[PDB]
Design a protein around this ligand. Structure first.
Ligand SMILES: *[C@@H]1O[C@H](CO)[C@@H](O[C@@H]2O[C@H](CO)[C@@H](O[C@H]3O[C@H](CO)[C@@H](O)[C@H](O)[C@@H]3O)[C@H](O)[C@H]2NC(C)=O)[C@H](O)[C@H]1NC(C)=O
Ligand SMILES: *[C@@H]1O[C@H](CO)[C@@H](O[C@@H]2O[C@H](CO)[C@@H](O[C@H]3O[C@H](CO)[C@@H](O)[C@H](O)[C@@H]3O)[C@H](O)[C@H]2NC(C)=O)[C@H](O)[C@H]1NC(C)=O
Ligand SMILES: *[C@@H]1O[C@H](CO)[C@@H](O[C@@H]2O[C@H](CO)[C@@H](O[C@H]3O[C@H](CO)[C@@H](O)[C@H](O)[C@@H]3O)[C@H](O)[C@H]2NC(C)=O)[C@H](O)[C@H]1NC(C)=O
Ligand SMILES: *[C@@H]1O[C@H](CO[C@@H]2O[C@@H](C)[C@@H](O)[C@@H](O)[C@@H]2O)[C@@H](O[C@@H]2O[C@H](CO)[C@@H](O)[C@H](O)[C@H]2NC(C)=O)[C@H](O)[C@H]1NC(C)=O
Ligand SMILES: *[C@@H]1O[C@H](CO)[C@@H](O[C@@H]2O[C@H](CO)[C@@H](O)[C@H](O)[C@H]2NC(C)=O)[C@H](O)[C@H]1NC(C)=O
Ligand SMILES: *[C@@H]1O[C@H](CO)[C@@H](O[C@@H]2O[C@H](CO)[C@@H](O)[C@H](O)[C@H]2NC(C)=O)[C@H](O)[C@H]1NC(C)=O
Ligand SMILES: *[C@@H]1O[C@H](CO)[C@@H](O[C@@H]2O[C@H](CO)[C@@H](O)[C@H](O)[C@H]2NC(C)=O)[C@H](O)[C@H]1NC(C)=O
Ligand SMILES: *[C@@H]1O[C@H](CO)[C@@H](O)[C@H](O)[C@H]1NC(C)=O
Ligand SMILES: *[C@@H]1O[C@H](CO)[C@@H](O)[C@H](O)[C@H]1NC(C)=O
Ligand SMILES: *[C@@H]1O[C@H](CO)[C@@H](O)[C@H](O)[C@H]1NC(C)=O
Ligand SMILES: *[C@@H]1O[C@H](CO)[C@@H](O)[C@H](O)[C@H]1NC(C)=O
Lengths: 240, 315, 40, 46
């Protein structure tokens, strides 16, 4: 489990040390912000119907009277240029806040906990996560258990014994084709079907697909060897 | 989960069939390209939103020809082969209950067709009923459905023995509850109101955007050819610019409207992707995250520009 | 010998799950998977 | 004693009640004390 983890963190570096594009979600943000400021500086070059885009070309030429009709055009077009930028940034800031509220929730539930939510903390059965910072962003290394090498088994919902039905306490019943076992649901590790592995309910007349197998009671042998202990005590006694 | 993708010929919306208006529109610099970058940033994420929700499955899982589920009857939610698109009976109710250029405006197709959304949904449904949650966390590992439900009963704190004893009843109740889903969807109009309201908006917004061209904005006409035939160049331009200024604000109002709406649709797609991961690929302890009751399992269903979850709960 | 091609996208490998009323698959082993998630 | 666990005396728990708690081990041994006794009573003969 440790060698797997150490190899999985190894691949993490390899990938980040290799590919140019892994942080594409964060670069995008930098690219969007820059593009919006470069677009806003380009707006300044526009006439909006004025004789020039430059106030010094208007002031030096037209007198105050003729100038104000040109200056107003540049004011009107620029004001919108700023309003556009600020509306785009207020909409874009709500995209980033929704992502910061998610990242704060992954910090609480994946790093400060162990999550039972499916696919919230990576693709698998989440175990733990490690936070790592990035430009204007967070990276979560999510560690997950992934079950790897399955076998087919025959299975039953219950075992029938003394006409009583028996169900697993934790686990599932399985058969290798000849012998019956109870095992934990998420990893094949089989045990003999013992009273300590099972609970009774009702009889074998209500469960669809119940199978006949013995259910072992560890108390009997320890009482049965005691019976043999009692017997031989009576036999040795049959001597005087 | 998504809304219609649009893009617009800013120059054709503002100045369609006018070289004079096009040569005046150059005075505003990048007041059209940005609008197209905004509508593209929306359109690119409608495909993202759809995937985030549906493409959560690694492999296209198929159901076994023999339906030995022990009683639970999913025929109404499983693919129906006798169709051009393999949608389920309930998906073909959902697709009927929601009813859906010279202005330079156009509507772009989604990247995933309704057949591909139905194949992703079928695979999710198949994997869920053949393998439980295991296809979300590894490879799909088969388990019998009644036995799978027994685990689900343990997940709500109910002892597995109870399910086996009432298996038939539990199967009947489910089959009777999926029966009521169709009847409700067949009979009742307003059930898909959330998806019809998104289509209504996409339509009202484009209708309002086109209706604006007829507006004067204080010019002598709303028709560029009237302004250009009746007035000289130095007077005509003023009336042309009067429309331009008003048209360019009519576009900037639309694009802003779509951006604000697109943030509501993204929040709903991110929620639908979370309900797909946590309710379909798992079993949820989150109260009221997967319907009222103790959530057991959920089945996803595709609808026009959206998703339907059929949540199954112990009450 | 290179060109641009155009095709209908695949949705994933097709898989028929081996379901039966009495069969279960149980994992005999596991892997530890570390996966990176990036958030703005 | 299989459905339940023990922790502390009664006095401390507000609203504790009195009922018997069955031990499956008791009879499983008392039916073995009759298996002792009937084998002893037989041995009285020889
Ligand atoms: C299903 O699992 C059963 C439990 O392990 C297993 O039963 C065991 O089978 C082995 C042989 O396969 C028996 O071992 C006997 O035979 C070997 C080979 O000659 C020698 O070590 C001894 O002779 C030994 O007695 C086990 O005794 C037997 N255990 C039980 C519980 O009876 C089944 O074979 C498995 N069935 C399959 C493969 O489907
Ligand atoms: C699993 O255990 C069941 C319980 O013993 C067992 O049922 C038993 O089947 C035998 C064989 O048929 C019956 O024996 C005789 O009785 C039936 C009527 O019940 C008559 O048709 C014949 O005389 C028959 O030989 C037992 O009566 C019957 N016991 C009960 C009460 O059900 C199953 O057969 C076992 N299944 C497996 C896996 O072998
Ligand atoms: C529930 O079980 C309690 C524990 O056995 C029991 O308390 C017992 O009550 C009897 C009757 O009052 C006491 O018997 C006598 O002894 C007390 C002093 O301890 C004297 O005041 C009287 O002589 C009394 O009759 C037991 O001593 C006492 N046992 C203990 C350990 O405190 C409760 O009465 C039971 N409750 C019910 C409702 O049955
Ligand atoms: C799990 O079972 C499937 C199908 O059931 C088995 O079919 C036999 C091959 C045999 O194993 C029986 O005990 C089972 O009932 C297996 O699918 C088979 O795969 C092999 C190749 O590995 C192929 O030649 C067979 O035709 C397939 N059989 C069918 C009916 O599709 C599958 O391999 C098993 N999985 C594991 C992990 O063992
Ligand atoms: C169970 O899976 C693990 C891997 O998760 C296997 O361990 C590897 O074994 C190979 C040799 O077969 C070694 O080279 C690797 O280094 C091991 N893994 C790691 C990460 O150290 C293990 O063999 C598997 N067991 C079975 C029975 O298949
Ligand atoms: C499972 O449900 C389907 C419906 O989805 C049932 O099929 C119906 O069966 C009745 C009775 O024969 C017919 O009258 C209907 O026309 C069928 N409807 C369809 C759409 O097939 C089927 O019988 C159910 N099976 C079980 C397990 O009871
Ligand atoms: C527990 O509730 C179930 C319903 O959820 C009851 O089952 C129904 O029983 C009636 C007869 O009383 C049958 O006609 C119905 O067909 C049964 N339901 C279904 C869906 O099949 C059950 O009787 C209740 N048990 C008790 C003890 O009241
Ligand atoms: C499983 O299905 C077969 C038919 O395919 C049937 O004969 C058998 O009785 C069923 N077993 C169970 C578990 O009910
Ligand atoms: C008989 O049992 C007694 C103990 O009761 C022991 O001391 C003695 O060695 C035994 N002898 C034989 C022959 O079993
Ligand atoms: C419960 O309430 C009754 C009165 O109705 C009171 O006599 C008794 O002491 C209370 N017991 C507890 C456990 O508070
Ligand atoms: C008494 O014990 C003998 C063996 O010592 C045995 O053969 C006989 O059946 C027993 N009789 C009774 C009454 O159990």
């Amino acid at each position: 489990i440790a060698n797997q983890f150490n190899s999985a963190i190894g691949k993490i570096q390899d990938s980040l040390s290799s590919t140019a594009s892994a942080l594409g979600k964060l670069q995008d943000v930098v690219n969007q912000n820059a593009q919006a400021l470069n677009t806003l500086v380009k707006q300044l070059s526009s006439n909006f119907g004025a004789i020039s885009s430059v106030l010094n070309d208007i002031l030096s030429r037209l007198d105050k009277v003729e100038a104000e009709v040109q200056i107003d055009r540049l004011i009107t077009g620029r004001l919108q240029s700023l309003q556009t930028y600020v509306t785009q940034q207020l909409i874009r800031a709500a995209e980033i806040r929704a992502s910061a509220n998610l990242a704060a929730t992954k910090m609480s539930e994946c790093v400060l906990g162990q999550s039972k939510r499916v696919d919230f903390c990576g693709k698998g059965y989440h175990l733990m996560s490690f936070p790592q910072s990035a430009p204007h962003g967070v990276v979560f290394l999510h560690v997950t258990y992934v079950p790897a090498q399955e076998k087919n088994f025959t299975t039953a919902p219950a075992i029938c014994h003394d006409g009583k039905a028996h169900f697993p306490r934790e686990g599932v019943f399985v058969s290798n084709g000849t012998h019956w076992f109870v095992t934990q649901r998420n990893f094949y590790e089989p045990q003999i079907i013992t009273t300590d592995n099972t609970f009774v309910s009702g009889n074998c007349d209500v469960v669809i697909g119940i199978v006949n197998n013995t259910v072992y009671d560890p108390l009997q042998p320890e009482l049965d060897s005691f019976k043999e202990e009692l017997d031989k005590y009576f036999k040795n006694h049959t001597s005087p | 989960v998504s809304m219609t993708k649009t893009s617009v010929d800013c120059t054709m919306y503002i100045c369609g069939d006018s070289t004079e208006c096009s040569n005046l529109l150059l005075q505003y610099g990048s007041f059209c390209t940005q609008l197209n970058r905004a509508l593209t940033g929306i359109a690119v994420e409608q495909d993202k939103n759809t995937q985030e929700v549906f493409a959560q499955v690694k492999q296209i899982y198929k159901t076994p020809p023999i339906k030995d589920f022990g009683g639970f009857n999913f025929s109404q939610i499983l693919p129906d082969p006798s169709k051009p698109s393999k949608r389920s009976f309930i998906e073909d109710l959902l697709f009927n209950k929601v009813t859906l250029k010279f202005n330079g405006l156009t509507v772009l197709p989604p990247l995933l067709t309704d057949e591909m959304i139905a194949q992703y949904t079928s695979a999710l449904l198949a994997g869920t009923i053949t393998s439980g949650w295991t296809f979300g966390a590894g490879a799909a590992l088969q388990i019998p459905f009644a036995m799978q439900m027994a685990y689900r009963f343990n997940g709500i704190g109910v002892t597995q023995n109870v399910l086996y004893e009432n298996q038939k009843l539990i199967a009947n109740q489910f089959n009777s509850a999926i029966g009521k889903i169709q009847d409700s969807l067949s009979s009742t109009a307003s059930a898909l109101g959330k998806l019809q309201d998104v289509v209504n908006q996409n339509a009202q917004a484009l209708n309002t955007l086109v209706k604006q061209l007829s507006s004067n904005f204080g010019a002598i006409s709303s028709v560029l050819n009237d302004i250009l035939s009746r007035l000289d160049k130095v007077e005509a331009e003023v009336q042309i610019d009067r429309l331009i200024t008003g048209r360019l604000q009519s576009l900037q109002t639309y694009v802003t409207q779509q951006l604000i709406r697109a943030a509501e649709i993204r929040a709903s797609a991110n929620l639908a992707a979370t309900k797909m991961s946590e309710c379909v690929l798992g079993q949820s302890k989150r109260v009221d995250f997967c319907g009222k009751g103790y959530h057991l399992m959920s089945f996803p269903q595709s609808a026009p520009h959206g998703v339907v979850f059929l949540h199954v709960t112990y009450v | 010998s290179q060109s641009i091609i155009a095709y209908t996208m695949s949705l994933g490998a097709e898989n028929s799950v081996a379901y039966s009323n009495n069969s279960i698959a149980i994992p005999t082993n596991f892997t530890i998977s570390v996966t990176t998630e990036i958030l703005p």
